Amino acid sequence: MEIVSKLTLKTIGAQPKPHSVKENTALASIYGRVRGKKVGQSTFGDFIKFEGEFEGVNIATGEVFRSGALILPKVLESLLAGAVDGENTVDFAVEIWAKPSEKGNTGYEYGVKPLIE
Numbered sequence: 001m002e003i004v005s006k007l008t009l010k011t012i013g014a015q016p017k018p019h020s021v022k023e024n025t026a027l028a029s030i031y032g033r034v035r036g037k038k039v040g041q042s043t044f045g046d047f048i049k050f051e052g053e054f055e056g057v058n059i060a061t062g063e064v065f066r067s068g069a070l071i072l073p074k075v076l077e078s079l080l081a082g083a084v085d086g087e088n089t090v091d092f093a094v095e096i097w098a099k100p101s102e103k104g105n106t107g108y109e110y111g112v113k114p115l116i117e
Helices: 074-083
Strands: 025-042 045-058 064-070 090-100 108-114
Touching: 025 064, 045 074, 074 090, 074 108
Parallel strands: none
Antiparallel strands: 025 045, 025 090, 045 064, 090 108
């Protein structure tokens, strides 16, 4: 089990290269306990650093990762930010997918579903 300072689709090794997603592709399973969040700033946009305890699995490789921080793609970050707006602690378990999309920077969008689904 590798420890990463931030759990992200990139640090898990599961971010597809641009224009490589031609069908729905399962990327990672993420198990989380969220107990805080901080806004982070980068040159070309802000993001939320979720804090707590996270475990991620790269579905294609089987590799397992652990972290105290989580950063999600924008569409999923907004979903989790709502879900943690009214509860002091949130536990979750989700699977993240890439779906083919309109031509953009990457040609794919992110989807998410509960692992229990």
